[PDB]
Design an enzyme around this catalytic site. Structure first.
Site, PDB file in Angstrom:
ATOM      1  CE  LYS C  85     -24.160   8.228  26.886  1.00  0.00           C
ATOM      2  NZ  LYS C  85     -25.140   7.671  26.478  1.00  0.00           N
ATOM      3  CD  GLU C 107     -14.126  10.354  24.177  1.00  0.00           C
ATOM      4  OE1 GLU C 107     -13.059  10.519  24.471  1.00  0.00           O
ATOM      5  OE2 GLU C 107     -15.155   9.800  24.865  1.00  0.00           O
ATOM      6  CB  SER C 375     -31.555   3.002  27.914  1.00  0.00           C
ATOM      7  OG  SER C 375     -31.500   3.888  26.222  1.00  0.00           O
TER       8      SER C 375
HETATM    9  C1  LIG Z   1     -25.461   6.478  25.658  1.00  0.00           C
HETATM   10  C2  LIG Z   1     -27.311   5.866  25.057  1.00  0.00           C
HETATM   11  C3  LIG Z   1     -27.014   4.868  25.135  1.00  0.00           C
HETATM   12  C4  LIG Z   1     -26.219   4.492  23.792  1.00  0.00           C
HETATM   13  O1  LIG Z   1     -24.567   3.601  24.781  1.00  0.00           O
HETATM   14  P1  LIG Z   1     -24.743   2.713  25.264  1.00  0.00           P
HETATM   15  O2  LIG Z   1     -23.681   2.659  25.183  1.00  0.00           O
HETATM   16  O3  LIG Z   1     -25.189   1.242  23.602  1.00  0.00           O
HETATM   17  O4  LIG Z   1     -25.477   2.324  26.377  1.00  0.00           O
HETATM   18  C5  LIG Z   1     -28.166   3.931  24.768  1.00  0.00           C
HETATM   19  N1  LIG Z   1     -29.966   4.644  25.839  1.00  0.00           N
HETATM   20  C6  LIG Z   1     -29.966   6.391  26.270  1.00  0.00           C
HETATM   21  C7  LIG Z   1     -30.861   6.968  26.082  1.00  0.00           C
HETATM   22  C8  LIG Z   1     -28.496   6.537  25.874  1.00  0.00           C
HETATM   23  O5  LIG Z   1     -27.964   7.909  25.991  1.00  0.00           O
END
Ligand SMILES: *Cc1c(COP(=O)(O)O)cnc(C)c1O
Ligand SMILES: *Cc1c(COP(=O)(O)O)cnc(C)c1O
Ligand SMILES: [K+]
Ligand SMILES: [K+]
Lengths: 389, 255, 389, 255
Positions: C85, C107, C375
């Site tokens: 993010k 938000e 992620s």
């Molecule tokens: C916000 C989040 C996501 C889910 O959203 P995407 O927009 O699909 O990328 C995925 N992984 C992590 C670790 C997050 O904090």
């Protein structure tokens, strides 16, 4: 020994005779490992591709606006695990393996070293048992779950105070009988030789990177490098490469807790006296009788009743200077970094930052290039701080 | 120093081994402790190994740790220990008294000063648990100057060089992977102080076996603390049980 | 518009007329920013020296031992903030500044985007207000404190369901009146154009680095890159640089929750139908009537009732393939990575890992070089998992 | 379509402006809603702007949101809305009826099909809140085919090009940084459908002012929903209060 166990009058190997062979084999393994390019290549690959080195060197302009201080933060908070602890924990694990050992023994208070020990062991196929005092167990539940999640076996100690020092004892008793197959993974740059030496060498990349980085960004060495001092590993790791650069100030920050004068602190280097404990001759928190005491601090990661022998030595000769920082000063530094840089520092690290903010604020027209070792992240402190405010 | 020499000599004339019990000074309290010790001496103990309560027995197991806790709760301080030691010596002039100490309490207000007080109260030897032969220089020199025997632990994972150091450094007695006969014989070869087997001496058969191996005797550590921990509720029966145990162990050294 | 707002039939700008100028000015600012070497240099410096890029590419041998699968994890969990993010949040903030704006509107649901928005704004001197539904407020207390700690103003919404979609509405109402001085920082690669496009471009370094890294370690491109799909930003950031490498499979994982058949999931791309909501034409969770529904998942970060339009498009033409993973499969993947690699992955990321473990396990003799986009970190999930086990 | 033409013509002959109230279909319930609407028509409303409950009014404020909640709790569905619409039309043959919709509900089962149903029940116009002129192509073509007037919002931050698109695209009426006289005059120049001022029409003075600026009338949105929210407890007095409000606003359009 192959290496000097002492730093002036501080250090040594004050362990029962049965444990000496364990220390001697470890020392010899370290010396051979240190000269083996294969071990070095292996350690580096892990630090780089697994841990995430080199860590960033962040220039924080918002916090120093309107003063002549230029501040940089060595980003150990971005290291795999949340703190600098990961670096050495990886080198020691590789060392246990070089010795043909398959088990790892450790102990924890705030839980961070246990987590680091567990993550390294789980990564390198080592069976890890961690001793933790019950009082610390029920208080550091997150880290306990974390350790078990990583396959480590957490063993609750109840010997007397059921805390760190009581766990260290059990870990050592265990080690005396199993050193043939098990390696004792010490958490800081203290205890018996070769530990202070090994932990320093496996943390020295902090100082080395910072030097190359500051030289890159500023074209000159910093005027001072500042780090908190719990047991001494992050500080010594930062200081190490700068010891021969006489123009660079080395400032270590011990926790002042509720105030030195209150007696509730964790600052033995400057406000305690030499004793022999934890297998080393070093300054400690102790009664007039000789009974070791507990070090207090808002940050549990800074409650070591003693300090690393090389820190005691560097302070005896004038090379490094050590100061104190109160819980409130650390709390304020914590809040300041979150609000002005978007970084939540570990309350341990906030003590280091707090001092640099003091050096800046007290003499705002003094031109100074400083480096604070941001030893870890404070996501684990967001509740503590919350209970205070 | 000397009390040991005379003890081992009298023992050899009697062709028997020494039985040395261990106990923590002030456990479970001062008055109880003094009475226990007299019972041990009355029972037939040839010497005594006394422990002084420290923060956390850095090199001691749970049994001892728990004993220290009882001593601490009872408010036993090292100064109290020396008061107890003086009185024990005042009652018993020839029994050798060895102290089991940790480095900090010896180093606290000066090493030399520690041994001076030991000499003053009538202590014969001091074994500093967390001080290996490699760090012993100051402790043994101080002990020697004050006619105190510096006792050293000769571990199972000991090697030849270690055997030689312990032999030349130690006095009074040697606190005993390798064959038992190997250690004992090599110790005698090196003219080491009489060896006392301290490992797992909890039954009469253990004592006879030790002496049989050529050890000058046996040290029963935790065994004594056990009876104490169990009979903690009835001090009168604690003594009675301690009496019997020591009598048995001691009878097992008489060859 | 200057750029195509559509990806096939998906995308568009379905916002009230009043909001069109705001989208148009943002698009034009993006296009100019994208061709300005100064903006690029500034973005890169921040990503590198502040965020900690490039992130590591960890080869995980322990987890794939005994199979012909070679797995690598793109370490976004090591990025400043705990997740991917942070990358885009920094680029958007620089964009708000290029437009002379001093405020930021956002938000959140799980809190992660709010935290990222707050950290970026606090770093770049932007006043940040964050709308969060009460239900999410009282449930994500850590992140709420985190946001406030970083100076952001968290505004609790109570419109009906008092949740994400209700917050998005308030954030938009606000933006319609203040876009002159305030920038709306969208959290994922969805919503009205140019958002899906901007978020992709500010996340594309994930794919670019992974490509250089895998090419470095293996000398070939992976056989497949796998990523979880909440709104689509981490996935699209990974996929982006590989779209023209036809031999590289692009696998997106939607949350299967309790099971697709149960209806309790968050998988609209494969198990929902096109609708017009959130300012875009895209597949969504909705009743037969046309009433948008809630997406369920053990991982709150994956509860977006819709998906990014480029994902819907890539799936229509055969380029990318999307699958589903249950809470239990994600929970198992979570436990496996902790125990075998010493890495606690975010439950969101665990969905991606879970699928790769399935690809490996179902055909253990199949030789395949895979890359899972890790992620984010799962320290925030150690309690959730704890309540399950 | 046509009903608007005839309304604005009759209004011009009477030299007065139109007063158009807004209300949510099914708020606070079906029976209550139908009665409210009849009261509005009875009170003097020249047309009506009806809202159909959607997940979350993507482009609506709190007042409307709260109205939707009441409609949802009452179990009002879009199908129910069309049943209500048919009945309203069956009772009132000439009053123009405009719907305020969100794109999803129109697109749900087919855009064309949505407008066919609107034509079927007797609806005259549809304004799709979240569809700007740039995305309107399919909605307006479908509306036109079904003799429904596609209403567009001409915002304050509108520019000349936008003014021209709204003018050529819109039918029935134009839902009204820039000077009011600028918009109105430019709209008339471009032959736009009669403009109805929808911004903040909550008092009689507002209506007269709007018509005075040259706007063909005024749309009072939330004002009506307010009386509803407040008098929710006494439905009988809610009607009574709605009556008076509409009468006042309408009297203010009579020049
Ligand atoms: C916000 C989040 C996501 C889910 O959203 P995407 O927009 O699909 O990328 C995925 N992984 C992590 C670790 C997050 O904090
Ligand atoms: C363990 C810890 C410390 C305290 O110990 P040192 O050995 O002095 O370095 C400092 N910072 C962090 C973030 C830690 O987790
Ligand atoms: K300390
Ligand atoms: K989704």
């Amino acid at each position: 020994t192959l290496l000097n166990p002492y730093f002036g009058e501080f250090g040594g190997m004050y362990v029962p005779q049965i444990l000496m062979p364990a220390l001697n084999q470890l020392e010899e393994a370290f010396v051979r490992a240190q000269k083996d390019p294969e071990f070095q290549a292996q350690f580096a690959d892990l630090l780089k591709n697994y841990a995430g080195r080199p860590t960033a060197l962040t220039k924080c302009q918002n916090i120093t606006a309107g003063t002549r201080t230029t501040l940089y933060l060595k980003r150990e908070d971005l290291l795999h695990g949340g703190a600098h602890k990961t670096n050495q924990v990886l080198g020691q694990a590789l060392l246990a393996k070089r010795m043909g050992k398959s088990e790892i023994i450790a102990e924890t208070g705030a839980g961070q070293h246990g987590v680091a020990s567990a993550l390294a062991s789980a990564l390198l196929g080592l069976k890890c048992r961690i001793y933790m005092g019950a009082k610390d167990v029920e208080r550091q539940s997150p880290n306990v779950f974390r350790m078990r999640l990583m396959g480590a076996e957490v063993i609750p100690v109840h010997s007397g105070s059921a805390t760190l020092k009581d766990a260290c004892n059990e870990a050592l008793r265990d080690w005396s009988g199993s050193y043939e197959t098990a390696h004792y993974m010490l958490g800081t740059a203290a205890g018996p030789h070769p530990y202070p030496t090994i932990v320093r060498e496996f943390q020295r990349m902090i100082g080395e990177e910072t030097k190359a980085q500051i030289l890159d960004k500023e074209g000159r060495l910093p005027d001072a490098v500042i780090a908190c001092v719990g047991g001494g590993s992050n500080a010594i790791g930062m200081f190490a490469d700068f010891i021969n650069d006489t123009s660079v100030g080395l400032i270590g920050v011990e926790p002042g807790g509720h105030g030195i004068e209150t007696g509730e602190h964790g600052a033995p280097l400057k406000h305690g006296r030499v004793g022999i404990y934890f297998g080393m001759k070093a300054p400690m928190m102790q009664t007039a009788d000789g009974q070791i005491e507990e070090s207090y601090s808002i940050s549990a990661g800074l409650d070591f009743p003693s300090v690393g022998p090389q820190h005691a030595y560097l302070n005896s000769i004038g090379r490094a200077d050590y100061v104190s920082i109160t819980d409130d000063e650390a709390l304020e530094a914590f809040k300041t970094l979150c609000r002005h840089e978007g970084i939540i520092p570990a309350l341990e690290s906030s003590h280091a930052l707090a001092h640099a903010l003091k050096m800046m604020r007290e003499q705002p027209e003094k031109e100074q290039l400083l480096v604070v070792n941001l030893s870890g992240r404070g996501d684990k402190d967001i509740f503590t701080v919350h209970d205070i405010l | 120093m000397e009390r040991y020499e005379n003890l081992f000599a009298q023992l050899n004339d009697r062709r028997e081994g020494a039985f040395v019990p261990f106990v923590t000074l002030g456990d479970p309290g001062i008055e109880q402790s003094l009475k226990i010790i007299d019972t041990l001496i009355d029972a037939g103990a040839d010497a005594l190994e006394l422990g002084v309560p420290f923060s956390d027995p850095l090199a001691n197991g749970p049994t001892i740790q728990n004993a220290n806790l009882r001593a601490f709760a009872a408010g036993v301080t090292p100064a109290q220990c020396f008061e107890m030691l003086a009185l024990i010596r005042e009652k018993h002039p020839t029994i050798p008294i060895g102290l089991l100490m940790y480095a900090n309490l010896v180093f606290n207000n000066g090493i030399d000063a520690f041994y001076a007080r030991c000499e003053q109260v009538g202590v014969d030897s001091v074994l500093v648990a967390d001080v290996p032969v490699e760090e012993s220089a100051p402790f043994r020199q101080a002990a020697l100057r004050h006619n105190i025997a510096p006792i050293f632990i000769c571990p199972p994972n000991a090697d030849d060089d270690l055997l030689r150091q312990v032999a030349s450094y130690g006095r009074g007695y040697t606190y005993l992977a390798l064959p038992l006969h190997h250690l004992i014989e090599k110790l005698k070869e090196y003219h080491a102080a009489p060896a006392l087997q301290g490992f797992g001496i909890s039954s009469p058969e253990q004592v006879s076996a030790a002496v049989r191996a050529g050890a000058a005797g046996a040290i029963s550590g935790s065994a004594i603390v056990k009876i104490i921990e169990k009979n903690l509720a009835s001090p009168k029966q604690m003594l009675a049980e301690l009496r019997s145990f020591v009598s048995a162990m001691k009878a097992a050294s008489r060859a």
